[PDB]
Design a protein around this nucleic acid. Structure first.
Ligand SMILES: NC[C@@H]1O[C@H](O[C@H]2[C@@H](O)[C@H](O[C@@H]3[C@@H](O)[C@H](N)C[C@H](N)[C@H]3O[C@H]3O[C@H](CO)[C@@H](O)[C@H](O)[C@H]3N)O[C@@H]2CO)[C@H](N)[C@@H](O)[C@@H]1O
Ligand SMILES: [Mg+2]
Ligand SMILES: [Mg+2]
Ligand SMILES: [Mg+2]
Ligand SMILES: [Mg+2]
Ligand SMILES: [Mg+2]
Ligand SMILES: [Mg+2]
Ligand SMILES: [Mg+2]
Ligand SMILES: [Mg+2]
Ligand SMILES: [Mg+2]
Ligand SMILES: [Mg+2]
Ligand SMILES: [Mg+2]
Ligand SMILES: [Mg+2]
Ligand SMILES: [Mg+2]
Ligand SMILES: [Mg+2]
Ligand SMILES: [Mg+2]
Ligand SMILES: [Mg+2]
Ligand SMILES: [Mg+2]
Ligand SMILES: [Mg+2]
Ligand SMILES: [Mg+2]
Ligand SMILES: [Mg+2]
Ligand SMILES: [Mg+2]
Ligand SMILES: [Mg+2]
Ligand SMILES: [Mg+2]
Ligand SMILES: [Mg+2]
Ligand SMILES: [Mg+2]
Ligand SMILES: [Mg+2]
Ligand SMILES: [Mg+2]
Ligand SMILES: [Mg+2]
Ligand SMILES: [Mg+2]
Ligand SMILES: [Mg+2]
Ligand SMILES: [Mg+2]
Ligand SMILES: [Mg+2]
Ligand SMILES: [Mg+2]
Ligand SMILES: [Mg+2]
Ligand SMILES: [Mg+2]
Ligand SMILES: [Mg+2]
Ligand SMILES: [Mg+2]
Ligand SMILES: [Mg+2]
Ligand SMILES: [Mg+2]
Ligand SMILES: [Mg+2]
Ligand SMILES: [Mg+2]
Ligand SMILES: [Mg+2]
Ligand SMILES: [Mg+2]
Ligand SMILES: [Mg+2]
Ligand SMILES: [Mg+2]
Ligand SMILES: [Mg+2]
Ligand SMILES: [Mg+2]
Ligand SMILES: [Mg+2]
Ligand SMILES: [Mg+2]
Ligand SMILES: [Mg+2]
Ligand SMILES: [Mg+2]
Ligand SMILES: [Mg+2]
Ligand SMILES: [Mg+2]
Ligand SMILES: [Mg+2]
Ligand SMILES: [Mg+2]
Ligand SMILES: [Mg+2]
Ligand SMILES: [Mg+2]
Ligand SMILES: [Mg+2]
Ligand SMILES: [Mg+2]
Ligand SMILES: [Mg+2]
Ligand SMILES: [Mg+2]
Ligand SMILES: [Mg+2]
Ligand SMILES: [Mg+2]
Ligand SMILES: [Mg+2]
Ligand SMILES: [Mg+2]
Ligand SMILES: [Mg+2]
Ligand SMILES: [Mg+2]
Ligand SMILES: [Mg+2]
Ligand SMILES: [Mg+2]
Ligand SMILES: [Mg+2]
Ligand SMILES: [Mg+2]
Ligand SMILES: [Mg+2]
Ligand SMILES: [Mg+2]
Ligand SMILES: [Mg+2]
Ligand SMILES: [Mg+2]
Ligand SMILES: [Mg+2]
Ligand SMILES: [Mg+2]
Ligand SMILES: [Mg+2]
Ligand SMILES: [Mg+2]
Ligand SMILES: [Mg+2]
Ligand SMILES: [Mg+2]
Ligand SMILES: [Mg+2]
Ligand SMILES: [Mg+2]
Ligand SMILES: [Mg+2]
Ligand SMILES: [Mg+2]
Ligand SMILES: [Mg+2]
Ligand SMILES: [Mg+2]
Ligand SMILES: [Mg+2]
Ligand SMILES: [Mg+2]
Ligand SMILES: [Mg+2]
Ligand SMILES: [Mg+2]
Ligand SMILES: [Mg+2]
Ligand SMILES: [Mg+2]
Ligand SMILES: [Mg+2]
Ligand SMILES: [Mg+2]
Ligand SMILES: [Mg+2]
Ligand SMILES: [Mg+2]
Ligand SMILES: [Mg+2]
Ligand SMILES: [Mg+2]
Ligand SMILES: [Mg+2]
Ligand SMILES: [Mg+2]
Ligand SMILES: [Mg+2]
Ligand SMILES: [Mg+2]
Ligand SMILES: [Mg+2]
Ligand SMILES: [Mg+2]
Ligand SMILES: [Mg+2]
Ligand SMILES: [Mg+2]
Ligand SMILES: [Mg+2]
Ligand SMILES: [Mg+2]
Ligand SMILES: [Mg+2]
Ligand SMILES: [Mg+2]
Ligand SMILES: [Mg+2]
Ligand SMILES: [Mg+2]
Ligand SMILES: [Mg+2]
Ligand SMILES: [Mg+2]
Ligand SMILES: [Mg+2]
Ligand SMILES: [Mg+2]
Ligand SMILES: [Mg+2]
Ligand SMILES: [Mg+2]
Ligand SMILES: [Mg+2]
Ligand SMILES: [Mg+2]
Ligand SMILES: [Mg+2]
Ligand SMILES: [Mg+2]
Ligand SMILES: [Mg+2]
Ligand SMILES: [Mg+2]
Ligand SMILES: [Mg+2]
Ligand SMILES: [Mg+2]
Ligand SMILES: [Mg+2]
Ligand SMILES: [Mg+2]
Ligand SMILES: [Mg+2]
Ligand SMILES: [Mg+2]
Ligand SMILES: [Mg+2]
Ligand SMILES: [Mg+2]
Ligand SMILES: [Mg+2]
Ligand SMILES: [Mg+2]
Ligand SMILES: [Mg+2]
Ligand SMILES: [Mg+2]
Ligand SMILES: [Mg+2]
Ligand SMILES: [Mg+2]
Ligand SMILES: [Mg+2]
Ligand SMILES: [Mg+2]
Ligand SMILES: [Mg+2]
Ligand SMILES: [Mg+2]
Ligand SMILES: [Mg+2]
Ligand SMILES: [Mg+2]
Ligand SMILES: [Mg+2]
Lengths: 124, 138
RNA sequence: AGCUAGUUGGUGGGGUAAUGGCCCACCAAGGCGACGACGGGUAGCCGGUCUGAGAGGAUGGCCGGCCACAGGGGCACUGAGACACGGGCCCCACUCCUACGGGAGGCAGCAGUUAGGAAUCUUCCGCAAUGGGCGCAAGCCUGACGGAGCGACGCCGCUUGGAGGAAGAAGCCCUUCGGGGUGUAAACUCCUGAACCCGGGACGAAACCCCCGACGAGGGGACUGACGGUACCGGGGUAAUAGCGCCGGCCAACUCCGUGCCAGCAGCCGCGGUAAUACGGAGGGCGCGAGCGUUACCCGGAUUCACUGGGCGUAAAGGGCGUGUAGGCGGCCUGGGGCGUCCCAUGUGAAAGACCACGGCUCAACCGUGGGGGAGCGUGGGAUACGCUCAGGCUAGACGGUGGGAGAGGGUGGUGGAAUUCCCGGAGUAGCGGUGAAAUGCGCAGAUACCGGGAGGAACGCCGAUGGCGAAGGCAGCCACCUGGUCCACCCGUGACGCUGAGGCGCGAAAGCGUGGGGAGCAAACCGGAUUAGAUACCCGGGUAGUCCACGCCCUAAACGAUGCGCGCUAGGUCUCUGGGUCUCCUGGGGGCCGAAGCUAACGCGUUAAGCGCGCCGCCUGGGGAGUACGGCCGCAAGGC
RNA sequence: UUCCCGGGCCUUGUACACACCGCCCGUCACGCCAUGGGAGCGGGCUCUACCCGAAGUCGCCGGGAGCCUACGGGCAGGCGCCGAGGGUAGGGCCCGUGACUGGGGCGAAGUCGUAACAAGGUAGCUGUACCGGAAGGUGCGGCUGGA
RNA sequence: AAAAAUGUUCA
RNA sequence: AGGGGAUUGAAAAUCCCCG
RNA sequence: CGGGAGAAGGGGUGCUCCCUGGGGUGAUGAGCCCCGGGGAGCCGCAGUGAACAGGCUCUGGCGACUGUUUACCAAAAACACA
């Protein structure tokens, strides 16, 4: 593109899309679990990943993943959506912040616990 | 029809050189000779001289090259490995006295037109002036 | 994508502190817009802040400056100043009070409540200092301010100890069963001593006020501390919190067990299917540490919107081609102006922040003082190479003249022969046809094959090429008329008149469409016959629109060299079409091959560039979604842009 | 040595490479998501017009009525223009939602056939046109990225 | 100048 | 529909057997 | 694309007085008629003050349309029509 053209047209700034619309650029968004099923892996995996749809504050309703082993979310559990795609399940673009609201931390996790909201146990 | 005669002169030079030629004839132009004079006054070419191809006045420009080389591609290095016009007609390039270029960390030159004559990246700087950054060689 | 009635201007008024359609009469019809008017959306602006090597990109929270607003809307009054947050009037919404007869309120002041949200504090002390209002002053007010409180939210400082101590407890983990690791780590021994305890205790505060002089200048006297009995100094003085993330690669850190494409992990690549350094626990290790992680958002890396700093022959990207408007760009020489450009001086560029020193709190974080830099913009003086401009001149660019050339360039009118099909006539008989093989089909009602006569349509064999013409699409029998472009020669004329080209206008294969005409051959669809598992196909026999012409639409394409146009520069060899010459050769125009330098990711390109350069246009920015949807414009429709 | 099967080297084409026992297309079925059209239904922003029209400013008047006077005049009150908003009407722009309907994306091992890659077993592709379960077939014309 | 279709998933 | 045997590298699919 | 259009939805209309622009015949000046325009002001419930004088819109079916028809029960979606 010649200068003269540049003078006319000019370069166009990109502007990218939110890899996750959790509303008002919010660290997190709350909401109720409308449903709690159990979908299946993508391309080369096999298993029963646990997913849950959620009615967000913002009149929104979306699928959120659930971490660790076992849990306790029901058809009407209040929960916190964190925002983390699960590249292996089409759609799932948000994780549920464990150990918050109706979300129960992980029982007996001893390793990484900051993630999974597990309280620091005593060794006595 | 030649939009920028100067850029041409350089190209004519930049080509004749790339093949190792005795001299080249760029069309007559006072302002052109300037870039020439300077080009030589700085030792880039043996020199030049006016001629005439049937009422058509050109300028013989004698090229200076290096010594033959040892090994494959015994092609002699050149005095001018690089010439390129700066201020083009499609985008005039002006510079203030503090804006003058530092061609090839000093080894290079940067001919340019000024209100008070045609000087180089040093000359003009010494005169402490400015003007159309015509180009740069080295 | 067009907008506009106070709309643009005018004379005279009205209005104001004042200019002005700010307003009102009367008059004139103007005013703005692709340099983006008008309209929709979104938004307080800057100083700065964040990132970047920079250019840039993003941003406008604290503090400073400008504007705007005080539940929503309008209006004035008072006044130096307001259309005035804690003044007034009215309308509206909302909440409240009530003796149900009427009235009241306006936290976007401080603090606090509720709602919402992922989430953001004490209904604190004090006017002692600074600043502000009134007063002669004493002094009154001051949720401004000065301090304190709450939250690892941030920055900075600091502690959980220091020196010894085994060829090395225990426990726990590995183990080739010897041993190895945690590990000087611990215990243990010495010393220091955060916390806590007692004692002393601020700077910030000198003015206003009182006396002398004059109530001035100068000198002397006195009061005042929220924070606070806190900082800080001195004495005594106890070993006195550690956590989080990670360890397949990128990326620093590995072994055992459990589990068995389960459970689960996961930033991208990926891991788990019975020996997992990737899941879960453990021993160990790496990282950072009163923090460590996670999610969100900005800059970077991303030369990934490319001015710095990219591209389009096959990777995404040249417009189907042309003509040309605006616009962008422009040969050589001489002189005048000096707008761009450049230099000097001067104004400006608040403070804060940013950078350099130096000092103040034990350091730092904060903070003070001094210095140094700032684009931009104004004014004054000056320079004239380059761009601009006016003026004078030139002939290398461009255009013209006289004279000739080649060509399927285009349009109209006419014309020739070969072949196919049908019609009539003759002659003649058992099949012809078609195929891989067949069948359908045609034929004793006389076909095929052969001859003669005739009608009509469409295409033009040999020449013909690896050629020629055209801007592209495309153009072929022959002839004449009408007409375009292009090439050479002669140095004759003009004198930069040029290149490009948004928009616009024109042309634009085939298929398709409209009105009318024509119709032999071929032929989507269609119908039969075969093939096949099926055969809505390939093969066979039939067959309509169409293919043709006139006039008018549609406007697409592998509209391809998949290569925009113009000009300049950079080895040759070869064959070929065409032009000129004191013609084994020289020189001009075009088409092919091979190839210098050089270019390219490679293939290849290579004076017919994709080489080295300049001007201008067009266009690209991962794959799918999709050349789709919507809107607009065009079309009769199919559809197109 | 034609033909079936297998094997050598040279060559050509290639979209294959746990390599033709390869690869791969589209319809169909099932599941999840967004999304177009849609009789319409709901709300937000705005424009135009006329009807009522507060407060208030300004302009008249202040007459046969009132109040004040230092007789000039002032106030009250009357009328008008402007006017927030309110009403009625007819437009414009955007958002939501809607029976049903259209395609599109993605989802370990479901159905049907074989279009494409080797003359891909009728070169392929492509604009158009008709047609068919589906890929696709064919007609005209074009290109080589085919011979 | 060729009769002949296809061959589950992850490794 | 799950589980078990055969079968696989492990499935899918396919064959036999259960309240 | 003519049209949907009288779309819808509104406002004005009487009387008196003042100034003023062009027309026709005169004659170029005056009466005489002909179309306007601008200001004030008066009266009533009401000014096309009586009489003549459209209600409108959205949305389906059928038939293109103006037409024609069963004189005396059918005027149509029937007949006709380019
Ligand atoms: N990416 C698929 C898009 O849709 C179509 O593809 C769709 C279908 O053709 C395809 O269906 C395939 C079928 O083709 C193939 N022969 C058998 C296969 N089992 C089916 O599979 C489908 O359904 C199963 C559940 O039954 C899903 O688990 C699977 O993910 C899905 N692809 O599934 C696709 C949707 O996931 C187009 N043909 C394709 O070109 C286009 O890109
Ligand atoms: Mg799969
Ligand atoms: Mg896997
Ligand atoms: Mg993430
Ligand atoms: Mg005035
Ligand atoms: Mg004022
Ligand atoms: Mg105005
Ligand atoms: Mg005026
Ligand atoms: Mg607006
Ligand atoms: Mg705003
Ligand atoms: Mg950078
Ligand atoms: Mg910056
Ligand atoms: Mg960027
Ligand atoms: Mg920005
Ligand atoms: Mg800014
Ligand atoms: Mg912010
Ligand atoms: Mg501020
Ligand atoms: Mg307001
Ligand atoms: Mg409020
Ligand atoms: Mg208000
Ligand atoms: Mg006052
Ligand atoms: Mg006030
Ligand atoms: Mg208040
Ligand atoms: Mg109350
Ligand atoms: Mg009472
Ligand atoms: Mg009352
Ligand atoms: Mg408050
Ligand atoms: Mg709250
Ligand atoms: Mg809440
Ligand atoms: Mg005070
Ligand atoms: Mg004070
Ligand atoms: Mg120690
Ligand atoms: Mg040991
Ligand atoms: Mg041990
Ligand atoms: Mg050891
Ligand atoms: Mg350890
Ligand atoms: Mg001590
Ligand atoms: Mg003190
Ligand atoms: Mg005092
Ligand atoms: Mg004193
Ligand atoms: Mg005290
Ligand atoms: Mg002490
Ligand atoms: Mg001691
Ligand atoms: Mg201890
Ligand atoms: Mg790792
Ligand atoms: Mg490592
Ligand atoms: Mg399991
Ligand atoms: Mg982990
Ligand atoms: Mg095991
Ligand atoms: Mg093992
Ligand atoms: Mg194991
Ligand atoms: Mg592990
Ligand atoms: Mg990008
Ligand atoms: Mg660039
Ligand atoms: Mg390609
Ligand atoms: Mg391409
Ligand atoms: Mg193209
Ligand atoms: Mg042109
Ligand atoms: Mg121009
Ligand atoms: Mg100047
Ligand atoms: Mg400048
Ligand atoms: Mg200065
Ligand atoms: Mg400063
Ligand atoms: Mg210091
Ligand atoms: Mg300073
Ligand atoms: Mg400077
Ligand atoms: Mg001249
Ligand atoms: Mg003819
Ligand atoms: Mg014949
Ligand atoms: Mg026939
Ligand atoms: Mg006979
Ligand atoms: Mg016959
Ligand atoms: Mg040609
Ligand atoms: Mg022709
Ligand atoms: Mg001619
Ligand atoms: Mg001449
Ligand atoms: Mg002359
Ligand atoms: Mg055409
Ligand atoms: Mg045609
Ligand atoms: Mg048709
Ligand atoms: Mg036929
Ligand atoms: Mg046929
Ligand atoms: Mg059959
Ligand atoms: Mg078969
Ligand atoms: Mg025709
Ligand atoms: Mg046209
Ligand atoms: Mg195409
Ligand atoms: Mg081509
Ligand atoms: Mg040639
Ligand atoms: Mg040719
Ligand atoms: Mg080479
Ligand atoms: Mg080549
Ligand atoms: Mg040449
Ligand atoms: Mg050559
Ligand atoms: Mg290239
Ligand atoms: Mg172009
Ligand atoms: Mg994308
Ligand atoms: Mg995309
Ligand atoms: Mg449309
Ligand atoms: Mg239409
Ligand atoms: Mg039609
Ligand atoms: Mg491959
Ligand atoms: Mg196969
Ligand atoms: Mg396979
Ligand atoms: Mg919808
Ligand atoms: Mg709707
Ligand atoms: Mg009305
Ligand atoms: Mg009033
Ligand atoms: Mg909708
Ligand atoms: Mg749907
Ligand atoms: Mg659907
Ligand atoms: Mg579907
Ligand atoms: Mg689908
Ligand atoms: Mg499956
Ligand atoms: Mg095919
Ligand atoms: Mg095939
Ligand atoms: Mg084929
Ligand atoms: Mg065939
Ligand atoms: Mg086709
Ligand atoms: Mg069909
Ligand atoms: Mg169909
Ligand atoms: Mg079917
Ligand atoms: Mg297709
Ligand atoms: Mg067919
Ligand atoms: Mg064909
Ligand atoms: Mg073809
Ligand atoms: Mg073609
Ligand atoms: Mg071809
Ligand atoms: Mg091929
Ligand atoms: Mg056979
Ligand atoms: Mg199949
Ligand atoms: Mg297979
Ligand atoms: Mg399989
Ligand atoms: Mg797998
Ligand atoms: Mg395996
Ligand atoms: Mg109607
Ligand atoms: Mg109507
Ligand atoms: Mg009357
Ligand atoms: Mg009446
Ligand atoms: Mg009547
Ligand atoms: Mg009728
Ligand atoms: Mg009628
Ligand atoms: Mg009848
Ligand atoms: Mg009758
Ligand atoms: Mg009757
Ligand atoms: Mg009737
Ligand atoms: Mg009747």
């Amino acid at each position: 593109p010649t200068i003269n053209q540049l003078v006319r047209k000019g370069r166009e700034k990109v502007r990218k899309k939110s890899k996750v619309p959790a509303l008002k650029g919010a660290p997190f968004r709350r909401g109720v679990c409308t449903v709690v099923r159990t979908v299946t892996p993508k391309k080369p995996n096999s298993a029963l990943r646990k997913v849950a749809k959620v009615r967000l504050t913002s009149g929104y309703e979306v699928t959120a993943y659930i971490p660790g082993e076992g849990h306790n979310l029901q058809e009407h559990s209040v929960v916190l959506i964190r925002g983390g795609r699960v590249k292996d399940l089409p759609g799932v673009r948000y994780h549920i912040v464990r150990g918050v609201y109706d979300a129960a931390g992980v029982k007996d996790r001893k390793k990484s616990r900051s993630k999974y909201g597990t309280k620091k146990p005593k060794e006595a | 029809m030649l939009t920028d005669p100067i850029a041409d002169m350089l190209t004519r030079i930049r080509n004749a050189t790339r093949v190792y030629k005795e001299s080249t004839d760029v069309p007559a132009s006072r302002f052109k000779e300037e870039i020439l004079r300077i080009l030589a006054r700085e030792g880039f070419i043996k020199g030049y001289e006016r001629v005439d191809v049937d009422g058509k006045p050109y300028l013989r420009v004698y090229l200076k090259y290096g010594p033959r080389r040892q090994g494959p591609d015994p092609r002699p290095e050149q005095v001018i490995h690089h010439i390129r016009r700066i201020s083009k007609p499609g985008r005039r390039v002006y510079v203030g006295v503090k804006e003058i270029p530092r061609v090839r960390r000093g080894l290079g030159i940067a001919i340019l037109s000024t209100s008070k004559g045609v000087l180089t990246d040093r000359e003009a700087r010494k005169l402490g002036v400015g003007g159309e950054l015509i180009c740069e060689v080295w």
